[PDB]
Design a protein around this nucleic acid. Structure first.
Length: 412
RNA sequence: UUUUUU
């Protein structure tokens, strides 16, 4: 009643101050990026794969400007579509850069640059063509090479060019999985993510990115928010509901299911361990303002729609409010609960200036305690006999010692 | 600011 205004002030203040300015938008500074699409002249699968590998090798070049490397990655991702310019128009609209679409055209008469020529409408460019299809020194190998490994040409005549292009593009997306939010665990995380695809057969051994390629692609993604926006846009605006989804689009949706909520790890896990567990420690007043904050944050997330999982890799305006430093006691509690209840969360960096050590240790204590972690909420539905309740406590005691041992917060 | 897993 009287205290209703204070309880709803977090949600009301967030709605009141996050209202967008609106009106006309002043355009800012944007780089002009050359994106190369394949014209109908390039009907050779081998030529198409060579162009894809050239795009990938140009993206990796250190000397090339990051925006241009991002445009080579954009070219590569547009190769997956029959109309690449339609793809760039629907998913390529951003204020970060202006995409200048060039066409790669294959001419039998011209053997000057591998039978290729870059032409925009009537005009044809040779300076750009020698730059793009010229001999470029690879700082590091583009793909991993192993003994007794099927060659790409053999793999391309056996598995179609869609399969090879899908391998390459899926791997670019797998890079995005951790390029932005975990830049130090990008190589390990890439090969961990890539392991499912390799067993699946989506990525064959001849087209598996090297670590250097993964590091190079991740740097371009960290610098180019336009490329990340195009990928996030492709994931959101893709018509997943329609059954007719290309193997590549299906795999991109898999990778994007891995990209969802990157950077929001603490928000998601705070909800999962701090409030979803529903332990008696939630009755503390330390967590009450942070529970209100998290309630408003859930509304902010669920209002952001399908782009809510990407607010942190996209550097969204509201993304900084999902930072745990806005709900540090509830976050520390949930982090304690999570390091006890989840093995994987013990490698999550919880050693932070705002880690409430008493809330952290309290989460560990209630998560480790049999009386604390058993709820009567579901006992009526389950029809639990008192012998079973006592039996459950006996099982918990045997399964976990909980002899006053705490998890130290993992540092960065 | 980010950082686990999937």
């Amino acid at each position: 009643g009287l205290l209703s205004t204070f309880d709803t002030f977090s949600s009301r203040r967030s709605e009141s101050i996050n209202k967008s300015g609106g009106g006309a938008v002043i355009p800012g500074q944007r780089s002009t990026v050359s994106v190369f699409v394949l014209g109908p002249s390039v009907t050779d699968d081998a030529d198409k794969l060579s162009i894809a590998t050239t795009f990938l090798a140009h993206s990796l070049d250190t000397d090339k400007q990051h925006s241009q490397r991002g445009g080579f990655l954009v070219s590569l991702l547009a190769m997956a579509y029959s109309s690449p310019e339609l793809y760039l128009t629907t998913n390529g609209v951003n204020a970060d850069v202006k995409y200048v679409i060039y066409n790669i055209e294959k001419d039998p008469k011209r053997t000057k640059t591998d039978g290729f020529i870059v032409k925009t409408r009537d005009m044809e460019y040779e300076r750009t063509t020698e730059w793009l299809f010229g001999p470029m020194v690879n700082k590091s190998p583009l793909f991993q090479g192993q003994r007794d490994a099927a060659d790409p040409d053999t793999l391309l005549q056996i598995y179609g060019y869609p399969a090879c292009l899908g391998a390459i593009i899926v791997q670019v997306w797998i890079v995005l999985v951790k390029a932005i939010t975990s830049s130090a665990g990008l190589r390990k995380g890439f090969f961990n993510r890539l392991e499912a695809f390799r067993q699946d057969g989506t990525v064959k051994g001849a087209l598996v990115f090297t670590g250097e390629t993964v590091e190079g692609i991740g740097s371009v993604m960290r610098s180019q928010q336009s490329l990340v926006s195009l990928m996030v846009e492709t994931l959101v605006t893709m018509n997943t509901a329609r059954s007719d989804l290309t193997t590549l689009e299906k795999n991109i949706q898999i990778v994007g299911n891995y990209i969802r909520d990157a950077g929001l790890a603490s928000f998601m896990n705070t909800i999962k361990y701090g409030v979803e567990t529903k332990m008696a420690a939630l009755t503390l007043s330390n967590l009450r303002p942070d529970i209100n904050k998290l309630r408003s944050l859930i509304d902010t997330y669920l209002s952001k729609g399908p782009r809510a999982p990407f607010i942190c890799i996209l550097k969204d305006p509201v993304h900084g409010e999902f930072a745990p430093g806005n709900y540090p006691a509830l976050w520390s509690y949930a982090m304690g609960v999570a390091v006890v209840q989840n093995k994987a969360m013990q490698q999550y960096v919880t050693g932070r200036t705002y880690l409430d050590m008493e809330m952290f240790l309290l989460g560990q204590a209630v998560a480790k305690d049999a009386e604390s972690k058993i709820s009567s909420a579901l006992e009526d539905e389950l029809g639990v006999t008192d012998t079973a309740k006592e039996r459950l406590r006996h099982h918990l005691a045997n399964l976990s010692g909980g002899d006053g041992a705490y998890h130290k917060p993992t540092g960065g």
